[PDB]
Write an enzyme that holds these catalytic residues in place. Structure first.
Site, PDB file in Angstrom:
ATOM      1  N   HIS A 169       0.463  -1.730   0.160  1.00 14.22           N
ATOM      2  CA  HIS A 169       0.313  -0.083  -0.167  1.00 14.22           C
ATOM      3  C   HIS A 169       0.645   1.338  -0.349  1.00 14.22           C
ATOM      4  O   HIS A 169       0.338   2.212  -0.104  1.00 14.22           O
ATOM      5  CB  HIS A 169      -0.920  -0.249   0.976  1.00 14.22           C
ATOM      6  CG  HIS A 169      -0.572   0.209   2.055  1.00 14.22           C
ATOM      7  ND1 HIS A 169      -0.724  -1.217   3.385  1.00 14.22           N
ATOM      8  CD2 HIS A 169       0.150   1.083   3.192  1.00 14.22           C
ATOM      9  CE1 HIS A 169       0.484  -0.518   4.520  1.00 14.22           C
ATOM     10  NE2 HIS A 169       0.639   0.444   4.418  1.00 14.22           N
ATOM     11  N   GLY A 196       3.093   6.510  10.126  1.00 19.62           N
ATOM     12  CA  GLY A 196       4.814   6.091   9.322  1.00 19.62           C
ATOM     13  C   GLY A 196       5.960   4.200  10.294  1.00 19.62           C
ATOM     14  O   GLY A 196       6.669   4.397  10.103  1.00 19.62           O
ATOM     15  N   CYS A 203       4.610   1.481   9.911  1.00 21.55           N
ATOM     16  CA  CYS A 203       3.852   0.155   8.672  1.00 21.55           C
ATOM     17  C   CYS A 203       5.823   0.069   8.182  1.00 21.55           C
ATOM     18  O   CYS A 203       6.355   0.361   7.646  1.00 21.55           O
ATOM     19  CB  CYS A 203       3.416   0.718   7.638  1.00 21.55           C
ATOM     20  SG  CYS A 203       1.546   1.080   7.897  1.00 21.55           S
TER      21      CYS A 203
END
Ligand SMILES: C[C@@H](NC(=O)[C@H](Cc1ccccc1)NC(=O)OCc1ccccc1)C(=O)CCO
Ligand SMILES: C[C@@H](NC(=O)[C@H](Cc1ccccc1)NC(=O)OCc1ccccc1)C(=O)CCO
EC number: 3.4.19.12
Lengths: 302, 299
Positions: free
Chosen positions: A42, A144, A146
């Site tokens: 993503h 942030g 991920c």
């Protein structure tokens, strides 16, 4: 020997693998092993895209030049890309000489691992957690984070088991393995998905009670024993995971270390559940802790 | 919603851990540049009843110390004592030496411990220097020489592990070899004093809770510092000082909640319990997160 702490694995072997990946206005963390960077797919998505994304469609519209990968402030040129389940695999033109010995493992619910929280490819902290029965993690991940990863280390081999993708509405976290397959029924798109019913990891509570006994806490022991079946009849009423013979067998080493029969420890647990800890503590805790595995206890106390 | 006590990433420290063996005693050492720092009782056996360390160290040579960095032997080319540490000069400057400093930590402050055995890191955890100058660690035989540290942008080493006290808590030195607390590196009757809860940190954690949206425990009242201490000291909390109130200034500014107003909330929690509820997913008041930790994590 004394004390009992929620201990994480030393993070140095993983720190040397963390990088930053940017696509458009989205930045997150990637894992750089040899000449490949792994990160959540993503990264390629617009907020409109997230949405109802068709990732093949969104990906075919990238090139290599769409991806900015940085180790520190040094750019790593992407020379190829592909998707594998919910991860992107980026090929870069340099190998990471800090790549440890490693493997990719899919862990089972109830198992524990260490998480290295990172922002913009920089390690921030390390903590130990468990994969809940419902395949979520009770983590600590700010915007942030991920692409941060979870791992175990047996001697010099790093087993990567988790990559962070999202936060669910209850504030718990969800995640893939390093083949990009989600733990649990979750999907990397904006929909009303929710964490399933969760349970207390019975095997782990029993492990921790053994830890307490190894550490000199015995007040919760009693002269009773139970059958597996009678235990489960009680424990299941308190939202505990059913205990199986395999779990009983797993507790073998600790039962022999302490000389308390597994089913005698189950009798203790039964009593604690029915009567509470009025208002005593075990290993300093007022609650029954379920994020230490039997293996965790053996490692920390042996 | 989703708070964890975290340790610092340990990689910078892992690169500094070595094994130090003198006779049949092995423990860990910290290798920075061309010096290895370790507990001076590496040269001891019985000696520990009334060790004349000077004399014991007279009978050792450089050759007496085996230091092992992974699979490599570092030749010891000099040795000396500094307070409760040995400083061994080695023939190789550690290529992995980080930017660092030695600091002496104050009671209540936190640091990460890298537990090590045979010079190999095994685990990392966060802990607090208790008001009674001990730490509630987890340490097995062979853990001596394991170190505690914080990282700011620079690794600040604050602790080296030396001993277990009779209650199972742990005692050690700073990196100049001076003990925290009254403890000595010999076999005595020494014991930890009574410990208290670290009020400053409980307040810090309540501010953290508020920052994260857990604020049910707040009320419309305030307290004087003295009236707070009268109550808190009954629950075995450390007295709160005006210096502590100031240290909470940034958190109080950020949240708009005066320290004494937060003290009023804590007083009610102590006097009335949680009535079922949780704070930051906990059923108890946490005391091993400092104001600086809160700021660091929540940024
Ligand atoms: C790249 C970033 N990803 C997100 O924000 C993800 C993207 C996403 C994945 C799967 C389904 C829907 C949305 N969004 C996401 O997790 O949405 C909810 C959320 C709650 C609290 C904090 C942050 C976010 C991060 O770094 C998120 C880390 O918190
Ligand atoms: C080299 C080892 N040092 C010790 O065993 C130290 C040596 C010492 C230091 C300072 C004063 C007296 C004695 N002994 C020590 O900590 O004795 C207390 C104790 C040890 C084990 C179980 C219960 C109580 C270690 O590795 C320490 C870590 O456990």
């Amino acid at each position: 020997a004394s004390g009992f702490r929620k201990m994480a694995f030393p993070s140095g072997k993983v720190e040397g693998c963390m990088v930053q990946v940017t696509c458009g206005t989205t930045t997150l963390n990637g894992l750089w092993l040899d000449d490949t960077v792994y990160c959540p797919r993503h990264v390629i998505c617009t907020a409109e895209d997230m949405l109802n994304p068709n990732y093949e469609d969104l990906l075919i519209r990238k090139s290599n030049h769409s991806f900015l990968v940085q180790a520190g402030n040094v750019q790593l040129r992407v020379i190829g890309h592909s998707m594998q389940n919910c991860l992107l695999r980026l090929k870069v033109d340099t190998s990471n000489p800090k790549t440890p010995k490693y493997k990719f493992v899919r862990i089972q619910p109830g198992q524990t691992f260490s998480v290295l929280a990172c922002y913009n490819g920089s390690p921030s902290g390390v903590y130990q957690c468990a994969m809940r029965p419902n395949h979520t993690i009770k983590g600590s991940f700010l915007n942030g984070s991920c692409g941060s990863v979870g791992f175990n280390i047996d001697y010099d081999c790093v087993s990567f088991c988790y990559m962070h993708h999202m936060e669910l509405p209850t504030g718990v976290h969800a995640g893939t393995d390093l083949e990009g397959k989600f733990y649990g029924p979750f999907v990397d798109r904006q929909t009303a998905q929710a964490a399933g019913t969760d349970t207390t990891i019975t095997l782990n509570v029993l492990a921790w009670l053994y830890a307490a006994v190894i550490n000199g806490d015995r007040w919760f022991l009693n002269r009773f024993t139970t059958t597996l079946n009678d235990f489960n009849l009680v424990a299941m009423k308190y939202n505990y995971e059913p205990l199986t013979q395999d779990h009983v067998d797993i507790l073998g080493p600790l039962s022999a270390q302490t000389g308390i029969a597994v089913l005698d420890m189950c009798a203790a647990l039964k009593e604690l559940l029915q009567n509470g800890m009025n208002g005593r503590t075990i290993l300093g805790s007022t609650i029954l802790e379920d994020e230490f595995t039997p293996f965790d206890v053996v490692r920390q106390c042996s």
